[PDB]
Every structure is written in C-alpha cells, then in structure tokens.
Amino acid sequence: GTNVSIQECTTNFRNFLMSFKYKTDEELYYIKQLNEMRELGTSNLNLDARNLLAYKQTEDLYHQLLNYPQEVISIMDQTIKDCMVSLIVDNNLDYDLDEIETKFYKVRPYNVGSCKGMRELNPNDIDKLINLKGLVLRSTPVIPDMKVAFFKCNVCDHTMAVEIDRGVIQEPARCERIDCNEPNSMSLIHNRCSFADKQVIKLQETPDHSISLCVYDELVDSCRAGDRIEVTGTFRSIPYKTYVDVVHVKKVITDQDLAKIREVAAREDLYSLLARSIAPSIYELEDVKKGILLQLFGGTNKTYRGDINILLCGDPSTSKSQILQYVHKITPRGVYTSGKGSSAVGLTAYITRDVDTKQLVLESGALVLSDGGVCCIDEFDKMSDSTRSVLHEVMEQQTISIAKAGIITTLNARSSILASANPIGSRYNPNLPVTENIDLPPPLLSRFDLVYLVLDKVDEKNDRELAKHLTNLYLELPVEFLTMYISYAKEHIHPIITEAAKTELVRAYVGMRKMGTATTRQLESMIRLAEAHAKMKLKNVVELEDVQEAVRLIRSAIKDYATDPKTGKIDMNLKSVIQRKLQEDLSREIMNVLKDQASDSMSFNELIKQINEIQEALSRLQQEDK
Amino acid sequence: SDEINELKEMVKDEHIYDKLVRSIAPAVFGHEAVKKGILLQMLGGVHKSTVEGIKLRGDINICVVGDPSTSKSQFLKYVVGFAPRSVYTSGKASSAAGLTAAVVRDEEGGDYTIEAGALMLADNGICCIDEFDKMDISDQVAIHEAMEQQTISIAKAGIHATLNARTSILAAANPVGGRYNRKLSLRGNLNMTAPIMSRFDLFFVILDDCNEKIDTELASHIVDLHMKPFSAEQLRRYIKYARTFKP
Ligand SMILES: Nc1ncnc2c1ncn2[C@@H]1O[C@H](COP(=O)(O)OP(=O)(O)O)[C@@H](O)[C@H]1O
Numbered sequence: 001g002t003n004v005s006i007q008e009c010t011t012n013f014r015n016f017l018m019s020f021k022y023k024t025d026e027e028l029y030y031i032k033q034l035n036e037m038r039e040l041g042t043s044n045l046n047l048d049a050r051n052l053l054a055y056k057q058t059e060d061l062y063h064q065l066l067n068y069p070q071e072v073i074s075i076m077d078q079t080i081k082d083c084m085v086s087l088i089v090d091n092n093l094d095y096d097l098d099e100i101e102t103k104f105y106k107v108r109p110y111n112v113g114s115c116k117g118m119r120e121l122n123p124n125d126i127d128k129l130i131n132l133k134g135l136v137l138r139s140t141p142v143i144p145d146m147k148v149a150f151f152k153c154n155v156c157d158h159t160m161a162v163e164i165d166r167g168v169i170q171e172p173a174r175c176e177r178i179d180c181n182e183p184n185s186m187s188l189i190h191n192r193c194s195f196a197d198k199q200v201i202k203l204q205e206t207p208d209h210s211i212s213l214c215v216y217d218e219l220v221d222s223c224r225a226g227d228r229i230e231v232t233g234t235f236r237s238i239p240y241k242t243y244v245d246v247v248h249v250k251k252v253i254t255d256q257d258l259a260k261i262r263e264v265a266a267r268e269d270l271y272s273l274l275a276r277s278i279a280p281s282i283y284e285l286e287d288v289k290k291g292i293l294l295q296l297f298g299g300t301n302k303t304y305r306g307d308i309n310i311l312l313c314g315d316p317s318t319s320k321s322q323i324l325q326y327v328h329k330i331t332p333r334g335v336y337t338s339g340k341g342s343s344a345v346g347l348t349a350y351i352t353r354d355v356d357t358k359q360l361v362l363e364s365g366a367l368v369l370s371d372g373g374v375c376c377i378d379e380f381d382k383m384s385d386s387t388r389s390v391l392h393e394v395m396e397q398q399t400i401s402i403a404k405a406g407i408i409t410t411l412n413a414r415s416s417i418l419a420s421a422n423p424i425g426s427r428y429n430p431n432l433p434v435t436e437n438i439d440l441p442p443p444l445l446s447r448f449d450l451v452y453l454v455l456d457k458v459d460e461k462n463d464r465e466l467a468k469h470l471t472n473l474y475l476e477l478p479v480e481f482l483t484m485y486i487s488y489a490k491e492h493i494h495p496i497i498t499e500a501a502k503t504e505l506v507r508a509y510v511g512m513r514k515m516g517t518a519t520t521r522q523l524e525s526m527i528r529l530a531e532a533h534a535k536m537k538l539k540n541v542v543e544l545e546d547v548q549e550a551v552r553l554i555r556s557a558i559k560d561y562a563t564d565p566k567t568g569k570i571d572m573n574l575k576s577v578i579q580r581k582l583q584e585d586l587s588r589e590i591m592n593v594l595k596d597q598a599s600d601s602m603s604f605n606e607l608i609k610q611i612n613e614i615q616e617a618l619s620r621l622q623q624e625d626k
Numbered sequence: 627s628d629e630i631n632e633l634k635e636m637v638k639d640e641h642i643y644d645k646l647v648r649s650i651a652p653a654v655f656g657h658e659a660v661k662k663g664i665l666l667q668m669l670g671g672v673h674k675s676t677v678e679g680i681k682l683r684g685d686i687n688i689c690v691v692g693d694p695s696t697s698k699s700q701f702l703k704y705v706v707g708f709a710p711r712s713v714y715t716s717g718k719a720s721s722a723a724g725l726t727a728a729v730v731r732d733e734e735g736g737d738y739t740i741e742a743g744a745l746m747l748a749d750n751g752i753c754c755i756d757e758f759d760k761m762d763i764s765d766q767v768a769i770h771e772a773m774e775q776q777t778i779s780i781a782k783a784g785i786h787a788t789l790n791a792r793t794s795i796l797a798a799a800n801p802v803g804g805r806y807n808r809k810l811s812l813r814g815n816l817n818m819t820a821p822i823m824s825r826f827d828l829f830f831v832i833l834d835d836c837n838e839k840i841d842t843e844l845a846s847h848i849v850d851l852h853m854k855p856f857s858a859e860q861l862r863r864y865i866k867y868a869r870t871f872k873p
C-alpha cells in the first residue's frame with residue numbers, strides 16, 4: 001500500500017504549519033512566513049526540513065515518508081495552491097490570484113535528517129528519500145526533455161495536443177475530425193513541441209565515491225563546477241546505474257562550547273597554552289608553534305587573500321616532518337604531497353575536452369583540490385623547475401592560466417602552502433650567507449611570508465632537557481576543542497586594522513629596509529600575520545600589540561638580530577664592554593633621578609617608565625647600600 | 627547628441643594625454659612610463675599598404691623587465707581585464723601550437739582544420755604574456771612572424787594558408803639572475819637575444835631602491851590597498867573613437 005494517507009497527512013501538515021515553534025525564540029515560524037510567501041512571486045517554497053526533526057509528529061511523518069516522498073510533494077503542491085487561494089480571497093487579504101491559480105507549484109525540503117550512508121544503502125532503500133554531501137566537479141549542457149507532443153494531420157492540417165504520462169508517447173491512430181477519418185495521418189512537428197531542461201551533474205560524494213546526479217527544471221545550472229553541495233533527494237537505480245534525483249540542493253555546537261571558547265580565550269596564558277597543546281611530541285619551539293598556528297588561522301580575505309605560507313629551513317634532523325604530518329591530520333582536511341613526488345600536471349590538473357559535454361573538463365590535481373584548505377609540500381627543495389613555475393602565479397594571484405592546443409582557460413587554486421626544505425648540503429652552514437644556504441631562487445624565496453631557521457646546537461643541558469621531555473612520554477587541550485576553536489575563529493571574527501596599528505607598519509618596514517633583501521613581499525606578511533593574530537585573540541580589530549608581535553615573529557623567523565648585515569652569516573652564540581658602559585650609564589642616571597625628585601625614594605615601576613621611555617643596576621646599588 | 631558630447635569632453639580638453647596616462651591601472655602606484663606605454667599600445671599606429679603591395683605593420687609591441695618585487699603582473703591583469711579583446715597566458719604554460727594555431731583533424735571529414743591559438747584569438751587586440759623570459763626559445767620563435775608581419779603562416783598537413791595575426795604583444799619578464807645585478811650593465815642582465823629585443827617598439831626596465839621617501843609612500847598605498855579624472859569605463863569609449871584616426 002501507501003504510507004501516505006492523503007487526508008491524514010494533509011491535516012497533519014496543516015497542524016504543523018500553524019503550530020510550530022523552535023522550542024526571541026517564542027514566536028511562531030510559519031505563522032510569520034505564510035504572509036511573506038503570499039507576498040512573494042516565487043514558484044516554490046524551501047521547506048525548513050529541520051523542523052521535521054524538531055517536532056514529534058513530523059519525525060513520525062519522516063519515518064512514514066521515507067518510502068513515499070512523491071505523494072506528499074504532490075499533495076503539498078495542491079495544499080500550497082489552496083492555502084494561497086484562502087489567504088488571498090477567503091481571508092480577503094489580497095487580490096492577485098489568477099496566475100497563482102493557473103500555475104503549478106512545488107516544495108523543496110532542504111534539511112532532512114541524513115541516512116546511513118551511500119554504500120550502506122540496500123536495494124530496498126532505492127526510491128527512498130536520502131540526504132548526502134560532497135563536492136561538485138562537472139556539469140552537462142542543457143538537455144531538453146519532452147513534456148508536450150504537437151501532432152498535425154498531414155492531409156487536413158488538424159492539430160492535436162498529446163502529453164506524456166509516465167514516459168509514454170501515444171501516437172493518435174486516426175484524425176479526430178468527423179469528415180477526415182484517414183488513419184495514421186497524424187504527424188509530429190518537432191519544433192512546435194514543449195520540453196523541459198534536464199542536466200546531469202557530477203558530484204564527489206562523501207557518505208556520513210563519485211555519484212552522477214540528475215536535475216530538472218530550475219535546478220539546472222544552479223549547481224556548477226566546484227560547488228560545495230549537500231543533497232536532499234531520491235536514491236535511484238532503475239532497470240541499474242546509481243544516481244540521485246535531486247529534490248533540493250544546499251550550497252554550503254552549543255552555548256557551553258561558546259563558554260569554553262570564551263574561558264580559553266580569556267586566560268592570560270592563551271598563546272602559551274595553544275602552543276603547548278598543539279604538538280606534545282615537539283618540545284618548545286614557541287615561534288614555530290605560533291607561526292604554524294597563525295597559518296591555520298589565516299588572514300582576512302577581501303576583494304587580497306590571507307593564505308599564509310611558511311618554509312622550514314632547519315637542520316635535516318629537527319622534527320619538521322612530524323609537524324607537517326600532524327598538521328595534515330589536525331587541520332580541516334587537505335592534501336599531503338611532496339615536491340619530489342609531484343609534477344606540474346599532478347599539482348594543477350589534467351584538462352581535456354569532451355565529446356559528450358562539448359566543453360572543457362578537469363581532473364583536479366592536489367594543488368587545486370586544496371582549494372580553501374591547507375596543503376603540505378615536503379621536499380620543496382626537490383621540486384622540478386616546471387612544477388616550481390606553477391607556484392609563482394598560485395602565490396601571486398591564486399590562479400593558474402593555461403594556454404595549449406585547443407585549451408585556453410584559468411583555474412583557481414586558493415590554498416595555504418606549508419613547506420619544508422633541507423639546507424644546501426648535509427647541514428646548514430653559517431659560514432655562508434643565509435641566501436646561499438637555501439636552494440630556492442630569489443624570486444621564489446623572496447615571496448614567502450615566514451621562513452624559519454630551526455637549527456640544532458650540541459649542548460649537554462638542552463640535550464638533557466629534550467631527552468627528558470621525550471623519553472618519559474612513551475611510558476605505559478583536546479584535538480576536538482582545538483578544531484572547534486579554529487573553526488569558530490574563522491567563522492566569526494573579521495578584524496579591521498586600526499590607525500595606530502597601521503602607523504607602525506611604516507616604521508617597521510623602513511627599519512627592515514634600511515639594513516639592505518627587504519622587498520615589498522614581506523609587507524604583505526606584515527598585515528597577513530597581524531590579521532591572523534587578531535583573529536587568534538578573537539579581538540574584532542587588529543591591535544598595535546598584535547602588529548608588534550607579528551613583526552617580532554617575522555624577525556625571529558628570519559633571525560635578523562643574529563644575522564651579519566655585511567655578509568649574511570649567522571653568529572654561533574646567538575659580558576661585553578658595551579654592556580658595561582650601558583649598565584654604568586644607566587646606574588649613574590638612575591642614581592641622579594632617584595634623588596632629583598623631591599622624595600628620598602620612589603616606586604620602581606615609575607622609575608622604569610621614566611628612564612626607559614634596570615633591575616640588575618638597582619640590585620647592585622642595593623648591594624652597595626646606595 | 628549626448629553620447630557625442632560625452633565623447634567630446636574626453637577629446638577637446640588641453641590636458642587629456644596626461645589625464646589618460648594617470649588613469650591606466652590606478653591600483654598600481656608609480657611606474658608612469660609603463661602607463662604611457664600601455665596607453666600608446668592600446669591606440670596602435672595606422673596600418674599602411676605600399677603602392678607596391680607591401681604592407682606596413684601598425685601595432686606596437688612592449689616588453690617590461692623588473693625585479694621580483696615590482697608589480698609587473700598587475701599591468702598584464704589590468705590590460706586583460708580592460709581590453710575589448712585580450713588573452714592572458716603564462717610563459718611556461720604556453721606552447722607553440724597554443725599561441726599561433728593548432729593543426730587538428732576536423733569533424734565531418736578526414737581532412738585537417740586550424741584552431742585558433744592565443745594569437746589568433748583576440749586578433750585586433752592586445753595579447754598578454756607573463757614570465758616571458760621563462761619561455762623556451764623554440765616556442766618564442768613562432769611569435770616573431772605575428773610580432774612583425776602580423777600574419778601566421780602554416781604549411782603543415784594539407785593546410786597552406788596564411789592567417790591574420792593583427793595583435794599587439796605585451797610581455798613581462800625577469801632579469802637573468804632574478805635580482806637586477808646592478809653591478810653590470812643592461813647588456814649582461816638580459817638573456818633575450820637581439821632579434822627579439824629589436825621587435826619591441828617600447829622597452830622598459832624598472833628597478834627597486836631603498837629610497838626612504840619612495841618606500842614610505844609605497845608602503846602607505848600598498849597598506850591602504852589591503853585596508854580600503856576619467857573612469858575606466860570612459861577609456862573604452864574614448865579609444866573606440868580615437869582608434870579610427872589616420873594621421
Ligand atoms: N624535537 C623532536 N621531537 C620528537 N622527535 C624528534 C625531534 N627531533 C628529531 N626527532 C626524531 O628524528 C627523526 C627524524 O625526523 P625528521 O628530522 O623530522 O625528518 P628527517 O628524518 O627527514 O630528517 C624522527 O623520527 C623524529 O621522531
């Protein structure tokens with residue numbers, strides 16, 4: 001039989017349509033939306049199918065409906081028409097009825113509860129209402145589908161209107177006119193018929209493999225290449241290919257979670273706690289932790305993306321592969337690749353025409369597949385030159401333009417790149433300039449945001465610290481909260497740079513400039529990192545402290561303070577006569593100031609603010625009883 | 627009458643040339659020489675045919691070389707976004723067949739038929755090529771005939787026709803060592819040979835320097851970009867009138 005009782009189901013949906021509320025949350029939902037829908041000239045209503053799970057009788061309706069969506073939709077069409085007629089003329093609230101009266105409507109539920117997954121669907125689950133998710137790849141051109149047949153009698157020009165019922169064409173046997181009774185005289189005029197748009201769309205599905213969906217009517221060309229899509233429709237296999245008849249398509253936490261986020265954000269050790277909890281297997285490296293976490297936060301996107309890219313140029317025994325392999329798993333899912341094991345086609349795409357589609361199609365590579373996410377590239381120093389040439393336009397415009405035989409098109413590859421590269425030779429050698437220690441040409445090396453020189457120094461004390469950190473770990477914030485925080489910050493905060501924060505950029509860039517490799521590329525980072533820091537703080541604007549911290553992070557990553565300005569070499573060690581002179585002058589000045597004021601003593605904070613605009617000098621003076 | 631008046635204001639004013647110079651790619655600060663060059667390239671010279679039948683090329687080619695920091699690609703993007711007909715391409719992505727014309731088997735028969743490459747497309751327009759120095763010489767050579775003869779000649783697989791290639795080539799490139807080796811002269815910093823350099827009516831090499839007064843304003847404007855006379859729509863209207871003159 002049928003699980004849908006026409007009168008019972010229409011009465012139940014009438015009761016739901018007039019009584020639903022979510023639990024200001026107290027106001028009724030469709031009691032408000034009915035007037036708006038009567039105002040609208042639209043031909044369809046997107047039914048909020050999450051309300052079906054929020055209310056009991058509608059959950060029962062879903063369980064009954066799982067096998068018979070079409071009957072309920074067909075009933076709801078007439079129900080919508082009747083409701084419109086009533087609210088217009090029976091309630092005497094409106095008078096525009098004729099076109100609504102004559103036309104046909106539909107309804108599309110868009111938030112139905114999900115099923116058990118595509119591969120788990122059984123042969124009896126065919127023709128059931130289903131809900132799925134994935135990413136769209138390809139689209140077929142508009143294909144007309146027959147609805148009306150226009151037959152003309154080839155001996156008397158009489159015309160008959162014939163329509164298709166359940167995919168059946170019925171050719172009239174004889175002319176219907178009283179005089180003209182010639183059999184088989186009816187003929188079809190191809191271009192006087194009526195058709196409707198049908199389109200096949202390819203979708204890479206991920207159950208809660210690729211599935212080729214089918215769409216009809218206004219659903220065509222609403223889904224295009226690269227769309228992030230959730231599907232509500234019918235799973236189909238007919239005498240047997242698997243395909244989905246789409247009924248609606250979607251183009252796209254607790255308050256306790258908000259309380260937890262606020263608590264973690266408010267505590268003063270926020271940065272320290274984040275760095276400490278991101279990677280337990282990697283000890284210390286505060287700057288590297290801050291940089292990679294900032295890359296995960298990302299900058300603000302304006303129309304000017306915020307895709308921060310970081311290069312690790314440490315010694316070839318420091319934990320760097322362990323960080324990237326972990327990032328590949330903790331971040332929202334991306335693609336893990338290696339420069340040595342990649343090619344230009346492997347990153348960008350394979351592109352070719354199609355006979356059936358009559359337009360270009362793409363076999364997406366990892367670099368384009370990472371659109372909107374994060375990609376990891378080990379062996380960045382070993383990437384082929386032709387492949388490296390792709391990175392240029394990717395990092396400069398987030399696009400890839402190709403012009404070859406019969407194909408001229410551009411593809412978007414907006415993604416963040418985290419890369420590791422061993423130094424030239426078996427180890428980093430500070431006896432050579434820092435530029436000469438990296439095997440990347442200046443045009444590619446100069447456009448990164450952060451480059452980290454994670455060197456290894458042999459020292460018994462630090463070796464003991466690391467060994468005691470590691471050896472006791474394998475005896476015998478959670479990642480869920482970390483991902484929750486990362487998603488929330490990207491979801492909500494859009495920080496704007498303040499005037500004071502803007503002003504310091506000029507001085508910082510000029511200071512980096514006057515020590516001349518301080519190209520204009522690093523000035524992009526001087527805002528990209530600042531916006532990411534503001535997002536991490538969850539502050540709605542970029543603070544001057546955020547800018548100063550970003551500048552400090554860049555300086556520490558590059559390690560300019562330990563870098564020789566004359567030859568680019570690095571000091572190994574990073575009591576001096578300049579230290580002695582500074583301490584002596586500071587002690588003299590504070591000794592003068594502490595008694596120049598009309599008091600025998602003063603607070604040390606006020607003295608520090610007066611002089612710096614210290615502790616060792618005052619401690620030594622106290623040792624001398626001054 | 628109103629259309630004529632609007633187009634007339636842009637022509638009958640004393641300072642229109644400087645106004646149009648200061649209007650190409652308003653996002654890119656400075657670099658006024660390239661702004662003049664692109665403006666002149668968009669209004670290429672009158673084509674002439676000799677009474678002997680020999681034709682004189684009228685389109686203007688431009689090449690720009692700069693350090694990896696100076697914004698040389700934004701000019702190419704502005705041109706392809708503004709030109710009525712334009713094609714953008716990359717030096718390494720492009721190939722010989724993809725620029726001039728492709729010899730491909732045709733439908734409805736067993737004979738061959740051409741397909742339009744990057745140069746045949748946007749004919750009577752501006753073609754933009756980025757990373758020009760990265761191009762292989764074997765596929766740089768094929769651009770020469772379009773650059774000087776405004777034609778594409780094919781003698782391959784049953785096709786022996788000569789095709790129109792009236793296009794203005796705009797290119798961007800980098801010095802041989804990426805950075806401008808300011809120790810040496812212009813002769814040693816470029817890998818381009820004389821035959822291809824001779825075919826550019828305009829040629830600019832722009833550099834970077836640590837001048838504080840320049841870098842301060844550069845930083846201010848490139849930060850304003852990330853913070854946020856004649857409009858770009860009017861320039862196409864002006865060019866549609868200007869291009870027809872024959873001085
Ligand atoms: N700070 C560290 N913490 C944990 N493991 C480390 C650390 N430094 C080195 N290792 C170990 O040394 C090994 C070498 O890894 P790594 O240096 O990242 O790559 P590669 O072997 O290519 O140099 C890894 O197995 C890693 O576990």
Ligand SMILES: Nc1ncnc2c1ncn2[C@@H]1O[C@H](COP(=O)(O)OP(=O)(O)O)[C@@H](O)[C@H]1O
Pocket residue numbers: 392393396520521653654655656693694695696697698699700844847848
């Ligand atoms: N005068 C300028 N005005 C605004 N932005 C600039 C200027 N000069 C350089 N830039 C910035 O510097 C970057 C330079 O990139 P570019 O040199 O074009 O890369 P490529 O050399 O690969 O073409 C651009 O993204 C641009 O935003």
Ligand SMILES: [Zn+2]
Pocket residue numbers: 153154155156157158175176177180181182185
């Ligand atoms: Zn008849």
